[PDB]
């Protein structure tokens, strides 16, 4: 009886229409909520100004403590995948309406104007009827759970799964996905890094375990041909780990890719004097760079004979 009582003790009046099917997915912290919605004016003949099918992309939600306004988090628990009814939101539960309304309209699918309805409604924060189209609720830990779902301990052990999976995809030949997941691992390790005081020992420890991941992510861009991404990541890395080897080889290769011969040779000298007796591939690279420079110069850029033909 507590469900029915608590529903109607909090400014909410809902009638059971039809119950659903299946077990309950976890509604704990980190729970995902993917669904549409439809919004109806309580007294303005139900003018549907807000609706997900008018925009075409389903908005997600953060069920746990991370997100705000626990009214939404409560009302999601009431329904289930396929279960849809009408809701009526209390005045006290719509007090900060326009603040979120403008934020969500701005964070709608996303560009990278003016709206009189929004600021007029800002003048009058008023409750509405959200006939929310529930699609499904997922369970944390039961799939490729979202990186921001847990409290850093699941990630602390989960990241090796991502690393190994990316390696396996890479050696098979899948590159974009490997780069994406290495980026995701770097991101979770980075916002880990931004929780503890700098100058701590575990800080340096974290950096030590994340550096190979950053090199791995930098690797795929060479197949992807964004040599400048490689420059940006490597030059950031090497300001403090002066004694790595591949962290030199990759940026040397990138330098030599874009006709930056001078820095290419300068870097190759250092990578040789950190890793002696490994000449062959380096010789291949240096002389390929020189031959391509000479080739371009001899044929393509010799066109300038006319600059003083007059």
């Amino acid at each position: 009886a507590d469900l029915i009582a608590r529903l109607r003790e909090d400014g909410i009046q809902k009638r059971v229409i039809q119950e659903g099917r299946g077990e309950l997915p976890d509604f704990q912290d980190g729970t995902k909520a993917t669904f549409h919605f439809r919004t109806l004016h309580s007294d303005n003949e139900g003018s549907v100004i807000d609706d997900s099918r008018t925009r075409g992309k389903p908005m997600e939600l953060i069920v746990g403590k991370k997100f705000k306004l626990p009214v939404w988090e409560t009302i999601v628990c009431t329904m289930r995948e396929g279960e849809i009814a009408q809701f009526l939101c209390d005045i006290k539960h719509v007090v900060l309406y326009p603040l979120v309304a403008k934020s969500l309209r701005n964070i709608a699918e996303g560009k990278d104007l003016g709206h009189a309805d929004l600021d007029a409604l800002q003048q009058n924060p008023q409750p509405l009827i959200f006939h929310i189209e529930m699609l499904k609720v997922e369970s944390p830990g039961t799939y490729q759970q979202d990186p921001w779902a847990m409290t850093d301990e699941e990630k602390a052990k989960a990241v090796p799964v991502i690393h190994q999976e990316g390696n396996r995809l890479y050696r098979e030949g899948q590159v974009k996905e490997a780069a994406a997941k290495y980026y995701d691992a770097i991101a979770c390790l980075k916002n880990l890094q931004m929780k503890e005081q700098p100058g701590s020992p575990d800080w340096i420890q974290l950096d030590l375990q994340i550096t190979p991941l950053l090199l791995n992510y930098c690797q795929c861009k060479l197949v992807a041909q964004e040599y400048y991404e490689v420059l940006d990541h490597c030059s950031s890395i090497l300001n403090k780990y002066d004694d790595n080897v591949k962290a030199y080889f990759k940026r040397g290769k990138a330098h030599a890719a874009v006709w930056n011969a001078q820095e290419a040779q300068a870097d190759f000298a250092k990578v040789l004097e950190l890793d002696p007796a490994l000449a062959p591939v380096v010789s291949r690279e240096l002389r390929a760079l020189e031959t391509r420079i000479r080739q371009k110069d001899e044929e393509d850029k010799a066109r300038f004979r006319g600059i003083f033909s007059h």
Partner: protein, 620 residues
């Protein structure tokens, strides 16, 4: 029980104080005796207005000086009122007894007398240079008397039988053995000119008579009764220039701080201006027509150093030595009033729309320096500047006229800063502005950047440079979509070349102010512009550590209509990495960075790129 005693003071130590610790200059004895003589003359004049018989013993009111190197006795005589024997005992032989102050307070009405001496010490300054002092005096009511002392506790008073003085005083100073410098007429003339120039009675000097204080003061006279020739003569006699004064202001302030001021603007600026740094004597402060102090940077601000003139008062506090005002607060009021009147003199001079040029060409730098420094008078000095424009041609014009010529949609004042007018009048920055028929300002002098740092606004209109970012020109709707679509069809190239540079430009966009050039470089909204940084890096006293705190970013912009950038965009589309694309983009950046006024570091890089292009094209 109680015991009351007469509060006392002994004489030897007090005399030692007066001789030893009051006066630091040995030359001001002459200033003291001359002032005493002038007061003695004022007394005999005043007693003669209401009784013509007082002058039956002598008619001329003069002062003489009789240096005598044959026997080292400097002599000073006058034809004033004199003293009686009782006056001798009760006026000279008492340390802080002032006869003049007792004469002043016993005036039957508000008469026309303004005397100098008030302390009652100062006559004793004669012992700074003299071992023995004698005074031979005669007053109209008794017999001539003598007075003698050595400042050793006792003074004598004798009846006289010598050559009668007639009426007045004769103070004689037997000069010290090591101070026989004040008998030289160079020293005497220098001291008299410095200290007792503008005294109210003639001063002569027997070597062969010759008068010293020829020039009279004109600041006392009603300034509705002076002709320009009189002002010119006074200015010439004050500043030694052989030119006339360009302008003049002669006002007065009444109240608790009463003073008359008379200001001059020299015709041509001195060649050692801003550089002398040794003496800044241009506004001399007087109290009752006796010099007090030169401008120790409290009377007038530095940017009004060219002003010359006088400030005279009748009631200001002075220290014991009479060489310095007692209150610094007084000088703040004097400075405020003098600045306020100078800025009105300038405005009155600006009404003559022709003679104003001969003043601007001379002191525009001083006005701009004032705009930099003086934060309270900026809104009044901003109307005294005249600038070349894109429409005045060879004439310098105002900013008020600029507002009177602003188009119906014009909202701000556009300005550029460079180093030569013929260069700023053709830069890539102004091509579009000259197209829409707007008027820009050619501020092409180093101090202009300092002025613009502070101005930031004028008459509700705000200065906006064409070398900064996000320049907003009032423009119609037809272009409003052309520019947007151009930005939509240049994202690729803009980002690609921004990342080719990747370190030396902060951002890359589509230009808004070019017609013939394909690209240029503008600085950020804040921090230094190109010219400001170019000037700041050449100061020789610039604090090298704090450069970054006042640096500014860079911005590259693209003119989409230019054929070269159109072809470059066409090329880069087919291949995101062509070596020709990178080389030519770097060349365009170097050329634009040199065009926009920046100093290009490592110029041998640019030179060698050009040299190599010449190599290959020439066929070597």
């Amino acid at each position: 029980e109680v015991e009351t005693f007469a509060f006392q003071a002994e004489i030897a130590q007090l005399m030692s104080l007066i001789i030893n610790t009051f006066y630091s200059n040995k030359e001001i004895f002459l200033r003291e005796l001359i002032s005493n003589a002038s007061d003695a003359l004022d007394k005999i004049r005043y007693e003669s207005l209401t009784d013509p018989s007082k002058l039956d013993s002598g008619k001329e009111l003069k002062i003489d000086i009789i240096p005598n190197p044959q026997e080292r006795t400097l002599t000073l005589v006058d034809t004033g009122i004199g003293m009686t024997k009782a006056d001798l005992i009760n006026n000279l032989g008492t340390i802080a007894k002032s006869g003049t102050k007792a004469f002043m307070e016993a005036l039957q009405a508000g008469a026309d007398i303004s005397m100098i001496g008030q302390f009652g010490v100062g006559f004793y300054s004669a012992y700074l240079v003299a071992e023995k002092v004698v005074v031979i005096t005669k007053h109209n009511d008794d017999e001539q008397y003598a007075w003698e002392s050595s400042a050793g506790g006792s003074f004598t008073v004798r009846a006289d039988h010598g050559e009668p003085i007639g009426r007045g005083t004769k103070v004689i100073l037997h000069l010290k053995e090591d101070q026989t410098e004040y008998l030289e007429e160079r020293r005497v003339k220098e001291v008299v000119k410095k200290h007792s120039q503008f005294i109210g009675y003639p001063i002569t000097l027997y070597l062969d008579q010759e008068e010293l204080n020829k020039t009279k003061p004109i600041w006392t006279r009603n300034p509705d009764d002076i002709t320009q020739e009189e002002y010119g003569e006074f200015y010439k006699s004050l500043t030694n220039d052989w030119e006339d004064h360009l302008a003049v202001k002669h006002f007065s302030v009444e109240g608790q701080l009463e003073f008359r001021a008379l200001l001059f603007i020299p015709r041509r600026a001195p060649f050692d201006l801003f550089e002398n740094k040794k003496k800044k004597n241009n506004i001399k402060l007087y109290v009752r027509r006796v010099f007090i102090m030169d401008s120790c940077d409290e009377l007038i601000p530095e940017y009004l150093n060219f002003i010359r003139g006088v400030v005279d008062s009748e009631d200001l506090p002075l220290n014991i030595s009479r060489e310095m005002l007692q209150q610094s607060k007084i000088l703040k009021v004097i400075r405020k009033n003098i600045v306020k009147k100078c800025l009105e003199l300038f405005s009155e001079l600006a009404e003559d729309k022709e003679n104003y040029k001969k003043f601007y060409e001379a002191f525009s730098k001083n006005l701009k320096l004032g705009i930099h420094e003086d934060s309270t008078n900026r809104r009044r000095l901003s109307e005294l500047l005249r600038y070349h424009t894109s429409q005045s041609g060879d004439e310098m014009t105002s900013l008020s006229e600029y507002v009177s010529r602003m188009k119906e949609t014009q909202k701000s004042i556009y300005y550029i800063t460079g180093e030569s007018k013929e260069q700023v009048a053709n830069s890539a920055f102004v091509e579009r502005v000259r197209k829409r028929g707007f008027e820009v300002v050619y501020m092409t002098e180093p101090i202009d950047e300092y002025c613009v740092q502070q101005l930031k606004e004028f008459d509700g209109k705000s200065l906006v440079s064409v070398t900064k970012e996000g320049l907003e020109l009032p423009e119609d709707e037809e272009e409003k979509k052309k520019m947007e679509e151009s930005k939509a069809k240049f994202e690729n190239l803009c980002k690609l070349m921004k990342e080719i540079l990747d370190k030396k430009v902060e951002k890359v966009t589509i230009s808004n102010r070019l017609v013939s050039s394909p690209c240029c470089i503008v600085t950020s909204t804040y921090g230094w512009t190109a010219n400001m940084e170019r000037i700041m890096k050449a100061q020789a006293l610039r604090d090298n550590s704090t450069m970054g705190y006042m640096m500014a970013k860079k911005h590259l912009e693209i003119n989409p209509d230019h054929p070269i950038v159109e072809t470059l965009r066409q090329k880069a589309e087919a291949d995101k990495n062509d070596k020709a694309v990178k080389d030519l983009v770097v060349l365009l950046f170097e050329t634009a960075l040199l065009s926009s006024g920046f100093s290009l570091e490592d110029p041998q890089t640019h030179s060698n790129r050009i040299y190599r292009m010449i190599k290959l094209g020439l066929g070597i």
